[PDB]
Design a protein around this ligand. Structure first.
Ligand SMILES: *CC(=O)[C@@H](NC(=O)OCc1ccccc1)[C@@H](C)CC
Ligand SMILES: [Cl-]
Ligand code: NA
Length: 354
C-alpha cells in the first residue's frame, strides 16, 4: 500500500503569465483537499477581494482587476493526507488607450416600436467584430436582430420589422478587458434595460399634405402640414422620433450659411420633436399656417400648427415612427442617426463589421 492522497491546486492563470485579460475573474480550486488560505495582492501589496465557497473548494476574486498590474497569488490546500502551497504571479493587459461606451435608450425607459439599441464609443473601434461579440442583447419574446455600424464609433442593433409592443430588451455591454482593436480596451461595462410601448406611427403624405398619427392602428389626429419646398424638399422614408423640446433654437450659421443671407435664417421654435440628425423636426410654425395642408414652404422640417405641434410633443415618445411618402425628394440616408429602418434588411443583416 503505502499510499496517501495529496491535495492538488489548479488556477485560472499560470505563473509567469502575461497579457491576462481582466474580462474574467481569477479563481483557485482545490482537489483531494480544501483551501485553507488564499490571498492575492497587486504590485503595491494591496489585497484583492475574494470569496470562498462553503465547501472550501473554490475561491474567486469578487472585484474587477485592473490594467498594467502585477498580481501575486498565494494558496494553501490542506487534506486528510498532506498539504500543498503555490505562489503564482501574472501580468494583466497593458492597453494603449481606453474607450468608454454609451448606450441608448436609457435604463428603464419605455420607447416606441422603431427604437434601435445604440452603443456609442468615445474612440475609434478598429475591431468591430470584437465589439459585437462583447455586446449581449436579450429580447423577450425573443426576436431576431443584427448589428450595423453608422460610423467608426457607434453601432446599432434592431430586428427586421418594428418591435412588437410589450417586448423586454436587456443590453449588456461587456467590453471591460476586451481588446477592441489596436490596443483599445474597454474602460468599463454597461447594463441597461428598456421596454417597448404602444405602436405609434405617423404618416406624412405629400399628396394630401396631411400628417396622420395612428396609435395601435386607429387614426387619432390629422394634422395639416407644409413640408420642404421643391428646392429643399423633405426626403421620403422612415424617421425615428428622437429628442423632444418645449422650445429649441435652430441656427443656420451652424450649417455654414450666414443668417444675413438669402437662404439663412435664425429663429427659436416651439414644440419641436426631432426625427433626423440632419435637422428635420415636427414643430410649431405660426408663419406657415395658411400654407399647411396645401403647399410646401419649409426647408425640410414638417411645419404644423402650434396646437398640433404641442399635441405631437405630448403624444409621441422616443422611438415612435414618422413616415414621409410621395415627396419630390430622395430617401433619407440609412446612416443619418435616426434613419436605421431605411436600410434594406438584407444589407443590415449582413452587417459591415469587415
Ligand atoms: C427645420 C428645417 O427645415 C432645418 N432644420 C434645422 O435644423 O435648422 C437649420 C436651419 C437652416 C436654415 C435656416 C434656419 C435653420 C433643415 C436644415 C432640416 C433639413
Ligand atoms: Cl421652415
Ligand atoms: Na510584485
Amino acid at each position: 500500500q503505502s499510499d496517501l492522497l495529496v491535495p492538488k491546486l489548479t488556477a485560472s492563470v499560470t505563473d509567469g503569465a502575461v497579457g491576462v485579460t481582466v474580462d474574467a475573474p481569477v479563481s483557485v480550486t482545490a482537489a483531494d483537499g480544501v483551501l485553507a488560505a488564499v490571498t492575492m495582492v497587486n504590485d503595491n501589496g494591496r489585497p484583492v477581494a475574494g470569496r470562498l465557497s462553503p465547501d472550501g473548494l473554490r475561491w474567486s476574486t469578487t472585484e474587477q482587476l485592473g490594467y498594467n498590474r502585477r498580481y501575486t497569488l498565494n494558496a494553501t490546500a490542506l487534506g486528510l493526507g498532506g498539504a500543498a502551497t503555490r505562489q503564482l504571479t501574472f501580468q494583466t493587459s497593458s492597453p494603449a488607450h481606453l474607450t468608454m461606451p454609451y448606450v441608448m435608450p436609457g435604463d428603464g425607459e419605455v420607447v416606441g416600436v422603431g427604437e434601435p439599441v445604440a452603443i456609442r464609443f468615445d474612440e475609434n473601434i478598429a475591431d468591430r467584430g470584437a465589439a459585437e461579440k462583447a455586446i449581449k442583447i436579450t429580447t423577450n419574446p425573443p426576436v431576431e436582430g443584427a448589428f450595423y455600424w453608422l460610423n467608426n464609433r457607434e453601432v446599432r442593433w434592431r430586428p427586421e420589422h418594428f418591435w412588437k409592443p410589450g417586448t423586454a430588451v436587456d443590453v449588456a455591454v461587456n467590453t471591460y478587458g476586451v481588446d477592441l482593436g489596436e490596443g483599445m480596451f474597454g474602460e468599463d461595462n454597461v447594463q441597461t434595460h428598456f421596454t417597448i410601448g404602444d405602436e405609434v406611427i405617423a404618416t406624412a403624405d405629400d399628396n394630401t399634405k396631411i400628417l396622420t398619427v395612428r396609435v395601435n392602428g386607429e387614426v387619432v389626429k390629422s394634422m395639416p402640414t407644409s413640408m420642404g419646398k421643391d428646392s429643399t424638399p423633405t426626403a421620403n422614408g422612415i424617421y425615428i422620433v428622437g429628442s423632444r423640446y418645449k422650445h429649441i433654437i435652430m441656427d443656420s450659421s451652424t450649417y455654414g450659411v450666414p443668417v444675413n443671407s438669402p437662404n439663412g435664417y435664425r429663429t427659436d421654435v416651439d414644440w419641436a420633436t426631432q426625427i433626423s440628425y440632419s435637422g428635420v423636426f415636427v414643430h410649431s410654425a405660426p408663419w406657415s399656417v395658411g400654407a399647411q395642408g396645401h403647399t410646401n414652404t419649409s426647408h425640410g422640417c414638417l411645419n404644423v400648427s402650434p396646437s398640433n405641434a404641442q399635441w405631437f410633443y405630448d403624444h409621441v415618445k422616443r422611438g415612435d415612427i414618422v413616415e414621409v411618402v410621395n415627396t419630390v425628394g430622395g430617401t433619407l440616408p440609412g446612416i443619418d442617426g435616426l434613419g436605421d429602418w431605411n436600410i434594406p434588411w438584407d444589407q443590415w443583416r449582413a452587417g459591415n463589421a469587415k
